[PDB]
Amino acid sequence: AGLTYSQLMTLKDAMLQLDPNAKTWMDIEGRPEDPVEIALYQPSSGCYIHFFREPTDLKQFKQDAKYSHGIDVTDLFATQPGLTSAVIDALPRNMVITCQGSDDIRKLLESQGRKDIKLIDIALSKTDSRKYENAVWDQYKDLCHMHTGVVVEGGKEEITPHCALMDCIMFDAAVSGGLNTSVLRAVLPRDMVFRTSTPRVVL
Numbered sequence: 001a002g003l004t005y006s007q008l009m010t011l012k013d014a015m016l017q018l019d020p021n022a023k024t025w026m027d028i029e030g031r032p033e034d035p036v037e038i039a040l041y042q043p044s045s046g047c048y049i050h051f052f053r054e055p056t057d058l059k060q061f062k063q064d065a066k067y068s069h070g071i072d073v074t075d076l077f078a079t080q081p082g083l084t085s086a087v088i089d090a091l092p093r094n095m096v097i098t099c100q101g102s103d104d105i106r107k108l109l110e111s112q113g114r115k116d117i118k119l120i121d122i123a124l125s126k127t128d129s130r131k132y133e134n135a136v137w138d139q140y141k142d143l144c145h146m147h148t149g150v151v152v153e154g155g156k157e158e159i160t161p162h163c164a165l166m167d168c169i170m171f172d173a174a175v176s177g178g179l180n181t182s183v184l185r186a187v188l189p190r191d192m193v194f195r196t197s198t199p200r201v202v203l
């Protein structure tokens, strides 16, 4: 199980475009023991890691889908199992990672054998952290089309779906005074995030 040797080498060569000394946000969707969306974001350089994973616990996923990320589980079948472990293995040693609520990132990293990675815990309230939520989506929505379901928050209220990548961007904007100017560039090749499939032709 996991990535093949040549895949790991391509991933390692890929991870070199990460600046190991720059500020790096990280966030996930899904529980740290069963994540389905992973994102790292370096605002100063614009480099970001973004990929997806099929969940193990389908029951807990449906709750996360209805209260948080709104991802269709069928859109994750094409992801490669083991990408999350391989990427976490490939993060630079003694890296400093920033997050809004460091508890979940810590469990994920520690359970993957990366206790060397230090975490900066930014503690913004749940409305303070999403101040730039609309502005972030308005500029970067083309970077993730995976949040297709209706997300909701006694009484129900429909909300904007949570995206691990958009969270990293809007959290950094909240502590920096606005959106960054650095164009965003993906660290991971697209062929590594999803297995390409030709859609069925309508005859």
Ligand SMILES: [Zn+2]
Binding pocket: 037, 144, 145, 146, 147, 162, 163, 164, 165, 166
């Ligand atoms: Zn997303």
